[PDB]
Ligand binder design. Structure first.
Ligand SMILES: *P(=O)(O)[C@@H](NC(=O)OCc1ccccc1)c1ccc(C(=N)N)cc1
Ligand SMILES: [Ca+2]
Length: 223
């Protein structure tokens, strides 16, 4: 996160760190045994890390649980990033408590103008490269389908929305992928792509999670 602020230890109880020896992506816990993230973050050997604030230090509230499985969206296109969503079932269920908690799924899509919260451990600088330790947060608005298309002619599908500031200066960045965009308590977006980070007229682009609620629900009922 570029241009955001330090969240405060465990104030985003649903934020997940995906680690394969090092944090490579973020995620969102959606129930005792499942995490949603971006399908562009798939690889094998993922250990979900819940209860994290500083990812380089054991501070006491973590649950590190290996992935028993991952299901990348059947229609994921890595080239276009259309359908950038994947589900991660945990080896063991997590103990949910005030500091470790699941986010609820959307029953409706959020519209343009709705302010959300994007969080992650990704790069903070659009200057010399710098990765943090503790979770950064950014409050930011979903933009209009039209400004988003105007900003990326030809690349925005119906499962994509933009969120951010066309002025530049605040955005998500490398390493933030797969993590949350929560608006009014609902996980509405998954951090997916953008052109550079925090640049003028190039906002963050997010998987429109409301489009997948049915697939998610059906997958968790059978896996
Ligand atoms: P994420 O992996 O942290 C990152 N996306 C990533 O680099 O891969 C997708 C990609 C597709 C096409 C060209 C480049 C990258 C990411 C997430 C959010 C932003 C952002 N500016 N909001 C940037 C990169
Ligand atoms: Ca930690």
């Amino acid at each position: 996160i570029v241009g955001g602020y330090t969240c405060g230890a465990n104030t985003v109880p649903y934020q997940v760190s995906l680690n394969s020896g090092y944090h490579f992506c973020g995620g969102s816990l959606i129930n005792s045994q499942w995490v949603v993230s971006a399908a562009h973050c798939y690889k094998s050997g993922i250990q979900v890390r819940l209860g994290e604030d500083n990812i380089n230090v054991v501070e006491g509230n973590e649950q590190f649980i290996s992935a028993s499985k991952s299901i990348v969206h059947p229609s994921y296109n890595s080239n276009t990033l259309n359908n950038d969503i994947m589900l991660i079932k945990l080896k063991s269920a997590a103990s949910l408590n005030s500091r470790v908690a699941s986010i609820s799924l959307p029953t409706s899509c959020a519209s343009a103008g709705t302010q959300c919260l994007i969080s992650g451990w990704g790069n903070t600088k659009s200057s010399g490269t710098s990765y943090p330790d503790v979770l950064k947060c950014l409050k930011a608005p979903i933009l209009s389908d039209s400004s988003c298309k105007s900003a990326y002619p030809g690349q925005i599908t119906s499962n994509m929305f933009c969120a951010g500031y066309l002025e530049g200066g605040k955005d998500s960045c490398q390493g933030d992928s797969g993590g949350p965009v929560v608006c009014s308590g609902k996980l509405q977006g998954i951090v997916s792509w953008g052109s550079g980070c925090a640049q003028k007229n190039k906002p963050g682009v997010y998987t429109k999670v409301c489009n997948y609620v049915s697939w998610i629900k059906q997958t968790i009922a059978s896996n």
